[PDB]
């Protein structure tokens, strides 16, 4: 059972990659009782650059083939109390995203759910809440509202909405 991210154009099979991390943005509200909302960061490439874990692969929202963390998932941010400051989440165990060439790539829903749970646990330890809600990207250009990546000299765009739509409790 897998999550299917639809991609345009169809990514060839040799573009299958390893999600080693991602970049998030917390939705405005600070203390909304106990539910904190995060979304995939759709800002500037320099945010991904300031994360400094993305590796050599050009990618938005999700870091492909980047550097993984040593022991456990680690979240970082210039300022936790600021929403404009992005959240660089470095995974500990990569999640393989496999592309078939049929216009969509696939991610194991069990592995992605475990990754989301670990991310939510670390975000809960940081922001001191309980409920973590991953919501989709709140608009922008095609390169940052979608998960985009350059492979084989071609830029591919994949709707990552089904990766960021879940609730995680304590």
């Amino acid at each position, epitope marked *: 059972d897998t999550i299917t991210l639809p991609c345009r154009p169809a990514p060839p099979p040799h573009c299958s990659s390893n999600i080693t991390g991602l970049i998030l943005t917390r939705q405005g509200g600070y203390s909304n009782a106990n539910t904190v909302i995060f979304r995939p960061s759709g800002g*500037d*490439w*320099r945010d991904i*650059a*300031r994360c*400094q874990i*993305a*590796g*050599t*692969v*050009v990618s938005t929202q999700l870091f492909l083939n980047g550097s993984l963390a040593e022991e456990e998932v680690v979240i970082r941010s210039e300022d936790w109390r600021d929403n404009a400051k992005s959240i660089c989440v470095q995974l500990a165990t990569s999640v393989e995203i496999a592309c078939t060439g049929a216009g969509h790539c696939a991610i194991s829903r069990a592995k992605w759910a475990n990754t989301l749970k670990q991310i939510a646990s670390k975000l809960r330890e940081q922001y001191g809440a309980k409920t973590i809600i991953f919501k989709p990207s709140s608009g*922008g*250009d095609p390169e*940052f509202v979608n998960h985009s990546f*350059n492979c084989g*000299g*071609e830029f591919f765009y994949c709707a990552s909405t089904q990766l960021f739509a879940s609730t995680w409790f304590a």
Partner: antibody
Amino acid sequence: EVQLVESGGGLVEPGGSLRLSCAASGFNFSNYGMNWVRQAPGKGLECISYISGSSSTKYYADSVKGRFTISRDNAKNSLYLQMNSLRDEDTAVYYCARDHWGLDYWGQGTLVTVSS
Amino acid sequence: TVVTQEPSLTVSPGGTVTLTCASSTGAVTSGFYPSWFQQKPGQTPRTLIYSTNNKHSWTPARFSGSLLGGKAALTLSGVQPEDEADYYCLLYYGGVWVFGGGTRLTVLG
């Protein structure tokens, strides 16, 4: 198609001022940072200045700090370089380059000759 | 902060040449987002490689970016006579782009 077109340039007397303009088409100009990169005749490339998409971040090279001023109008798809206190060392072809994982798209370049 | 390239290199057609790009501030990593530009005489610099090794659609297949010994490396394998140009290396220093000195590549054939 991404297009960057420089205007301004030409002859300027030493100590005078000039304003380079760069009109952008084919992309959401507000969604990308911009760079001014100059090249003296017969010399290498030098990255002069950078302005962020919201014109919030501006970096300047040491050689042009305090003299050059980078600006932009997003509603007009225009990038601007206000060059003041020009010296003979500022004579160069000035290129306008988009900031997208590097300098992926450049302008055709406009020659600025500082001569009395 | 100086970004250093070989001033000139010479290669026969069909051969292989490797241009190196070193940073005075430590060793070049993937976070320096190296770019390689090709400038034929009087032409606008043209991006061949960005982010260590990514290519544009217009980049010829024979060009390849890489990282050896803390230096960025542009490898031209199977040189063609029109590959003769100046190759500038561009490094990223936390928001500050810094160009290299350039390398004059002469196809000696």
